[PDB]
Amino acid sequence: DPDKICLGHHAVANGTIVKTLTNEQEEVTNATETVESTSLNRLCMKGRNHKDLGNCHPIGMLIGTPACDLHLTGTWDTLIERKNAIAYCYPGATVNEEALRQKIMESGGISKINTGFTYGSSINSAGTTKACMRNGGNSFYAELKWLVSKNKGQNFPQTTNTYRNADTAEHLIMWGIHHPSSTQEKNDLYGTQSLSISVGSSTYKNNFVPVVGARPQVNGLSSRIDFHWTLVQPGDKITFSHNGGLIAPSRVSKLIGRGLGIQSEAPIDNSCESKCFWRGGSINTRLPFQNLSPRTVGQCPKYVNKKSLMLATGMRNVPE
Amino acid sequence: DPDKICLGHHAVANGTIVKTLTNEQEEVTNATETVESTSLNRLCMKGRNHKDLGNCHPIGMLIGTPACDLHLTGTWDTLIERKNAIAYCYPGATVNEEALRQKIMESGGISKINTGFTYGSSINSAGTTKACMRNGGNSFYAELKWLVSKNKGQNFPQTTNTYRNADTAEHLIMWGIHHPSSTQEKNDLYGTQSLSISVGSSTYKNNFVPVVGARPQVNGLSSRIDFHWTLVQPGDKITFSHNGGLIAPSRVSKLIGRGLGIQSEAPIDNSCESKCFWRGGSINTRLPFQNLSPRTVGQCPKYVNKKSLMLATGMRNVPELVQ
Amino acid sequence: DPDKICLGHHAVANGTIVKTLTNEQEEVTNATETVESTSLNRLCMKGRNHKDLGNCHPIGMLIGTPACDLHLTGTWDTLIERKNAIAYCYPGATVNEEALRQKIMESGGISKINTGFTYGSSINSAGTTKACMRNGGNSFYAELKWLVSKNKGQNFPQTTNTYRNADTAEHLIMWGIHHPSSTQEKNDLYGTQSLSISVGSSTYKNNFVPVVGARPQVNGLSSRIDFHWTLVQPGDKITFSHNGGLIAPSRVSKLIGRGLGIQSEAPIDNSCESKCFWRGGSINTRLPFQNLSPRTVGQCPKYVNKKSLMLATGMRNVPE
Amino acid sequence: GLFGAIAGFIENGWEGMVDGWYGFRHQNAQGTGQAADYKSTQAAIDQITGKLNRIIKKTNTEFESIESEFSEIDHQIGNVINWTKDSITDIWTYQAELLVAMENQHTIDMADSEMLNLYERVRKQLRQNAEEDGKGCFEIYHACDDSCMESIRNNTYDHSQYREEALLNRLN
Amino acid sequence: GLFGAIAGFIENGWEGMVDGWYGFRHQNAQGTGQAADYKSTQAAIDQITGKLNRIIKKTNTEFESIESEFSEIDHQIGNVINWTKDSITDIWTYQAELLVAMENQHTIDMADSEMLNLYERVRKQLRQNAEEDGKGCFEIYHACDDSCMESIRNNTYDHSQYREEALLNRLN
Amino acid sequence: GLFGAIAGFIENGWEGMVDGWYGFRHQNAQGTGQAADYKSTQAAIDQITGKLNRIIKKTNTEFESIESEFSEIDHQIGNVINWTKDSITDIWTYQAELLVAMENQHTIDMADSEMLNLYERVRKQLRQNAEEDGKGCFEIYHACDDSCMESIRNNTYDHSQYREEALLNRLN
Numbered sequence A, C: 001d002p003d004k005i006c007l008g009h010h011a012v013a014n015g016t017i018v019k020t021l022t023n024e025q026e027e028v029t030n031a032t033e034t035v036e037s038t039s040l041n042r043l044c045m046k047g048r049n050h051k052d053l054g055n056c057h058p059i060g061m062l063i064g065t066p067a068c069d070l071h072l073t074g075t076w077d078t079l080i081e082r083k084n085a086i087a088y089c090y091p092g093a094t095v096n097e098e099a100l101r102q103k104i105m106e107s108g109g110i111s112k113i114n115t116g117f118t119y120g121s122s123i124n125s126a127g128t129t130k131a132c133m134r135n136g137g138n139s140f141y142a143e144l145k146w147l148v149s150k151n152k153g154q155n156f157p158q159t160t161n162t163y164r165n166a167d168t169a170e171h172l173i174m175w176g177i178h179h180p181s182s183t184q185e186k187n188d189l190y191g192t193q194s195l196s197i198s199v200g201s202s203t204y205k206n207n208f209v210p211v212v213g214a215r216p217q218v219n220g221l222s223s224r225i226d227f228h229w230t231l232v233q234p235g236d237k238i239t240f241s242h243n244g245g246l247i248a249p250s251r252v253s254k255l256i257g258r259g260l261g262i263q264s265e266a267p268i269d270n271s272c273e274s275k276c277f278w279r280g281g282s283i284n285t286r287l288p289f290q291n292l293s294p295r296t297v298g299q300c301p302k303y304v305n306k307k308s309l310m311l312a313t314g315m316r317n318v319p320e
Numbered sequence B: 001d002p003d004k005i006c007l008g009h010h011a012v013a014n015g016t017i018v019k020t021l022t023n024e025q026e027e028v029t030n031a032t033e034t035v036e037s038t039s040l041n042r043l044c045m046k047g048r049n050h051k052d053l054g055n056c057h058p059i060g061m062l063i064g065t066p067a068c069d070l071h072l073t074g075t076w077d078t079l080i081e082r083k084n085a086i087a088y089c090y091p092g093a094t095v096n097e098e099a100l101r102q103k104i105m106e107s108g109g110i111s112k113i114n115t116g117f118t119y120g121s122s123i124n125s126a127g128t129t130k131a132c133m134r135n136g137g138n139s140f141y142a143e144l145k146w147l148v149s150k151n152k153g154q155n156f157p158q159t160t161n162t163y164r165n166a167d168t169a170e171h172l173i174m175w176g177i178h179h180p181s182s183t184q185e186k187n188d189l190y191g192t193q194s195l196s197i198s199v200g201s202s203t204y205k206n207n208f209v210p211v212v213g214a215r216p217q218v219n220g221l222s223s224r225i226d227f228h229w230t231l232v233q234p235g236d237k238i239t240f241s242h243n244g245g246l247i248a249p250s251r252v253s254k255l256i257g258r259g260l261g262i263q264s265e266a267p268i269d270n271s272c273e274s275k276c277f278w279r280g281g282s283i284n285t286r287l288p289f290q291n292l293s294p295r296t297v298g299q300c301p302k303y304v305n306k307k308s309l310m311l312a313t314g315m316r317n318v319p320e321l322v323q
Numbered sequence D, E, F: 001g002l003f004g005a006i007a008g009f010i011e012n013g014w015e016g017m018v019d020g021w022y023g024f025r026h027q028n029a030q031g032t033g034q035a036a037d038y039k040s041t042q043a044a045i046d047q048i049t050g051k052l053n054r055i056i057k058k059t060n061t062e063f064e065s066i067e068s069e070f071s072e073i074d075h076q077i078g079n080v081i082n083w084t085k086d087s088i089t090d091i092w093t094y095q096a097e098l099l100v101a102m103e104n105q106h107t108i109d110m111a112d113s114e115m116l117n118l119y120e121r122v123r124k125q126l127r128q129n130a131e132e133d134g135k136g137c138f139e140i141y142h143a144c145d146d147s148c149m150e151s152i153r154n155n156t157y158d159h160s161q162y163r164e165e166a167l168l169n170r171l172n
């Protein structure tokens, strides 16, 4: 008999399932994802003065490995490190290696300054090796010099070299200690004398002795060249005294500014931007969470142990 | 005149207090605890191939201390360490001791492989001591050998020993460096010559030198033997070039799989099961939180600085009036 | 026509904006701040037995630098360190420097115990230096003794000194190693013989060799005195075997109880009370959050990256 | 509370009702009686069951020991671990207190709403044959026997059957 | 639900209503019809848009690497990093699950309330000219053509214009 | 809002009401009145005070320094500390933003519910002696003097006293 007006709400055929405080299987008219599952398989470097190191290891930039010849100097806001990158052509290792790598990966460029070190007539300062090839010929670490006695068997003379930091900023200096394979090798290069290498500044000092010892060959070489480093402050001097065994620096490094070190396996792309990176590439999502990797760098969504979290963007779905 | 129908809700005489956003003393019909207080003072090890070490300390398993003779080799999913566990019979310590201990407590077994170091007729390999007793007599660390000169006073000849890893996985190798109590004691074993122990590998290098010096007695001995260690990779070797002072390994170790390390004083109980452990036993609760200890291991409830947190499982309790 | 009764709610002219779940510009009748923005530029020390070290560095308390003469012993629940605090009058440094500083700043006092170290007629134990001035005259670290040969040029004798801890608490023992500027100096003080210093207890052992080497002058001195330390347990002994180079302890230290270490530049104030401190002052607030600094000590509000967070203390303000 | 029924216009709960959370009491010419409502009770219990299933659990993440019980560790690394653990513990203590406080408020207000929803469906069903007394009861203006009272509880009460009689009693 | 309208006294939603979230269906001598309510629809959409602006974002804190991808590090420091990262991940996983669960509950109940608020404003509009049927409809006791129905939707219905006719038809 | 009263069917608030949060205005033969409701006002205030007691506080945990202000600590551990602190800062920033947003929503809706519960309490009291005008007022269909108005505010208004007079005026 009477006229009527009915009130209602919309609905859909296929609803989306979401979770609430009280219900794990709650159907709603629409929902949207909050955990990012997918990544771009690229390092997105638009709006960034970047540097892809290739097969050059960050430490190789400072000592000057053949692989790092294009990366001895420069400026950048982002530095990309790659897998199986070469730091040392000659067998050996750097003492306090990981901290040095982290310092370089936090920097925004490298300048190089000459030490100015010179050597007497009885020293040969241009010693080379088969392990460090350059231009199809024998060579050595570009920023260092292998000092040996010019006449084979003669005693390496007592030499004292001092580098002064004339800059207003902090400088980084590296050197190496040759540890020979045999006792005869040691006598041919440096002499029968007992070897000793002292290094000293206002903020650092240490002593080093070459050690003759048999050990397994790496690329046909049982000898080693281990590296050491320190920071030389503005105005301060650092003094090397040595009578054979020092791998002396021809140049020192200055780490300039700040930058974002990335370790990744993904190729560069300059057509698009990103603020979040990982091993597999870039994460350009607007979502607050991600499940790709717990290891990321930059401004990133927070990693969560969840495949999906649907956020409801609609009422309960109650279909006809 | 009119008939009546009333709606209502249930209640109880004495309810339970809970906290809300707006009220600390809110009464409800029932509630349930979310913070676990109690704990079984026992190690619940059902469905677990466990290993109670007792007096043996994890590092002692690698070097072969008298207390760790039964626990030299084995496999497990859970390794248990106790208080005052003996690692070193002879006085000394290991460099990066905690890193090594955590590696062993993370593993699920140890296998032993012989080094195959033979020494010439001017070397005394079976060097025992009073500190490391075995079967009512003087002995040494079972996985190592104390190398000294045959002739007292004469120099220790510069012998070389190399071990190649011919296995698919990494091999952990340990050695010791003796530090004599005096120059009299140093000259008897190794001689008047200058000592130098240089270990060499493809991925490791270090130089060691013995240290003569006056020290107080620990277990009646002023001298010490410090231990050092590294990982020998697959298809790789490690060379020991030494002239006295080096305590050479007769065997090396291999850490198998993974397992859960528990440092606790409480005894084993095989009838119960649990996934969370602490110093004073196991936590078998289903609840999200606990206030027993912040130091726990395994799949655990999260620690909170709270005695109680009651979650309401019912409506406000509005009881009937009382006279 | 009929009589009526109207329900309503209050409103205000001065509304306040707050953020809700659904709306970022929601107006309410009243609101209150949850993030503290302002700081008292002072250290609030009411109810605290405190020690302001001034220009004395915590490590200087143990070795006895001139600036630390009035802070050699004491008790406290709060210890305050300042910028550019003097630890070493003579050039050098301590091995495990930060770990030692953190131990002292965690303590609630220092007590000094005599070592009882005596030396023979051929040793001069009253070595002093112009680097460590005290009342306008040459002096030395108060808790240590610079040992040299009485006759200049002669060999320093093979000396043995042993300290026994008679106390029921652990004792902190410090010593130094002198590293000469040149060989001529080294010979004058300790003789031409080869120098060797060995320290040994139940829980600790080490060997130290004095190093003559070329290095720049700090405060006119190319020499260095480096320090080392360890904990001697109750009943245990510590023995020093040496023949030139040792800077031996005349007293050892005992850290007593617990305390709160603060590093700050702000002036002291004894009228104000606090439980939270930072570089620039104190945080007395009752609020749960603060945006002053991420580095704080004590019972503090949690740091947040937000200028303001207004908590509504009233309904929606609907004016007119 | 939020919906005004429990600890509101309904003066107090019934301690005698022990076979349900919500229910009916009636008075007619034949007698008195009590009967719990199944649907509203089960809706309240099912929602609370969902909270317990969601809240009463732990993470699957296996943590290892980073602090040694029976030996000392490096001083600086021990300070960092102590700072981190206390910071993490402050977060979980805060989150636990916020969780349970938030859940208790909602559980209370949810149960309040189910009381109101039962009151509302009965009101709409009775239509013009009853009036609200303000204390959670309906004064029905016709002879409503036990079968009529059952039809209110079982939701089969047809208002048009009793409408003529009820409006005459209401107008008077 | 908390407010009793959606998944409650309104039996189901309307799949045919594609032009809005909430709306009206009517019937009279002229025939049936349908129309969406813009005000209540926009009220719900604005609140969900507000949630998305707050939730769909990340922090602007620049994080650096503490775990090396292509090389090893000390075992002790690595265990502390692993413990800290897994503890932080447990917090964020938990916080994400709680946020979404809490927000989903509020979104559902918010939408439920907007339906109820619309229903309530129509009831008070009609005043004594209509009665509730229990299923979300109002039986209007007078001739209400397309213009009369439009005025109820437009919030311009004058109850006093039809009051006399409606009160007579209700009392019968 | 959730309950539909504040910023809803009640058009706006009263700046002239300085003695309470909620209240009454009336008009009768005797005069124009205004009065605050103490019970609903205090209920709202107590609930907000309870939040302030809960939220405005800090933890009892003693935190020591792990970062030197005036000297440089080791590089690797410094990065771990920087990472850990920035992660903890992101959690607390998020927790604080969520807390205040959640509580502000609940405070606004709680206040809205107290307005509705008072309005509903008055509606059920008046029974058939008044009608709702849509704007949050009740048109009372009998002479309701100052004592009568006070009885409505006091919650002791007896509808039966005026029922006969009121029904005659409503039907006209």
Ligand SMILES: CC(=O)N[C@@H]1[C@@H](O)[C@H](O[C@@H]2O[C@H](CO)[C@H](O)[C@H](O[C@]3(C(=O)O)C[C@H](O)[C@@H](NC(C)=O)[C@H]([C@H](O)[C@H](O)CO)O3)[C@H]2O)[C@@H](CO)O[C@H]1O
Pocket (backbone or CB within 6 Å): A127, A128, A129, A130, A131, A138, A146, A148, A180, A181, A185, A189, A220, A221, A222, A223, A224
């Ligand atoms: C039969 C056998 O296995 N003999 C090895 C013998 O090969 C090896 O000698 C070294 O072999 C390598 C690889 O063939 C190089 O030829 C070494 O020569 C150089 C080098 O290129 O590295 C020549 C170079 O001019 C030298 N440079 C300087 C500055 O002195 C260096 C240098 O002396 C050494 O690298 C120092 O360690 O060597 C050649 O010496 C020997 C030694 O490893 O071992 C036999 O068993």
Ligand SMILES: CC(=O)N[C@@H]1[C@@H](O)[C@H](O[C@@H]2O[C@H](CO)[C@H](O)[C@H](O[C@]3(C(=O)O)C[C@H](O)[C@@H](NC(C)=O)[C@H]([C@H](O)[C@H](O)CO)O3)[C@H]2O)[C@@H](CO)O[C@H]1O
Pocket (backbone or CB within 6 Å): B126, B127, B128, B129, B130, B131, B138, B146, B148, B179, B180, B181, B185, B189, B220, B221, B223, B224
């Ligand atoms: C009456 C008298 O004074 N007799 C001494 C006699 O004490 C001394 O014997 C040595 O004393 C030292 C210091 O007390 C050790 O106790 C020596 O014991 C052992 C040990 O058990 O540790 C014996 C063991 O066979 C030795 N092992 C090896 C491989 O050489 C070790 C080892 O030398 C040291 O531990 C190295 O630090 O010591 C004990 O022999 C003798 C010594 O010549 O002289 C008498 O006159």
Ligand SMILES: CC(=O)N[C@@H]1[C@@H](O)[C@H](O[C@@H]2O[C@H](CO)[C@H](O)[C@H](O[C@]3(C(=O)O)C[C@H](O)[C@@H](NC(C)=O)[C@H]([C@H](O)[C@H](O)CO)O3)[C@H]2O)[C@@H](CO)O[C@H]1O
Pocket (backbone or CB within 6 Å): C126, C127, C128, C129, C130, C131, C138, C146, C148, C180, C181, C185, C189, C219, C220, C221, C222, C223
């Ligand atoms: C031209 C030049 O630069 N020459 C320096 C020369 O100055 C320097 O001599 C030292 O100079 C300092 C001044 O800064 C002091 O005068 C040194 O004397 C004392 C001292 O006060 O420190 C005297 C003191 O009695 C000595 N104490 C003891 C226990 O021996 C000490 C001590 O020998 C030294 O501190 C140890 O290094 O020195 C004065 O020697 C020399 C030496 O650094 O170097 C020239 O190049």
Ligand SMILES: *[C@@H]1O[C@H](CO)[C@@H](O[C@@H]2O[C@H](CO)[C@@H](O)[C@H](O)[C@H]2NC(C)=O)[C@H](O)[C@H]1NC(C)=O
Pocket (backbone or CB within 6 Å): A258, F074, F075, F076, F078, F079, F082
């Ligand atoms: C940890 O973070 C702090 C603060 O961001 C870093 O200290 C800053 O270092 C830069 C140089 O890179 C200076 O310009 C600032 O003045 C420093 N600020 C403060 C407050 O100290 C610190 O370098 C970081 N640690 C590491 C190991 O990178």
Ligand SMILES: *[C@@H]1O[C@H](CO)[C@@H](O)[C@H](O)[C@H]1NC(C)=O
Pocket (backbone or CB within 6 Å): A030, A031, A032, A313
């Ligand atoms: C569902 O919600 C999302 C929120 O991101 C929105 O983009 C989309 O337009 C909504 N509607 C439909 C029909 O997908």
Ligand SMILES: *[C@@H]1O[C@H](CO)[C@@H](O)[C@H](O)[C@H]1NC(C)=O
Pocket (backbone or CB within 6 Å): B029, B030, B031, B032, B313
């Ligand atoms: C709380 O309520 C019941 C009834 O009192 C009690 O038996 C039980 O322990 C609790 N029930 C649940 C489901 O937590």
Ligand SMILES: *[C@@H]1O[C@H](CO)[C@@H](O)[C@H](O)[C@H]1NC(C)=O
Pocket (backbone or CB within 6 Å): C030, C031, C032, C313, F052
């Ligand atoms: C606003 O809220 C604060 C904090 O609770 C309170 O102290 C103050 O009295 C309130 N202001 C007014 C004007 O009511």
Ligand SMILES: *[C@@H]1O[C@H](CO)[C@@H](O)[C@H](O)[C@H]1NC(C)=O
Pocket (backbone or CB within 6 Å): D074, D075, D076, D078, D079, D082
């Ligand atoms: C860390 O906390 C434990 C337990 O409170 C304490 O014993 C220890 O001294 C603390 N570590 C440091 C380095 O202070």
Ligand SMILES: *[C@@H]1O[C@H](CO)[C@@H](O)[C@H](O)[C@H]1NC(C)=O
Pocket (backbone or CB within 6 Å): E074, E075, E076, E078, E079, E082
């Ligand atoms: C940290 O976790 C990863 C998980 O893949 C593991 O590979 C690594 O060994 C762990 N670090 C340590 C020190 O155990």
Ligand SMILES: [Ca+2]
Pocket (backbone or CB within 6 Å): C106, D078, D079, D082, F064
């Ligand atoms: Ca501490």
Ligand SMILES: [Ca+2]
Pocket (backbone or CB within 6 Å): B106, D064, E079, E082
């Ligand atoms: Ca691990």
Ligand SMILES: [Ca+2]
Pocket (backbone or CB within 6 Å): A106, E064, F079, F082
């Ligand atoms: Ca950094």
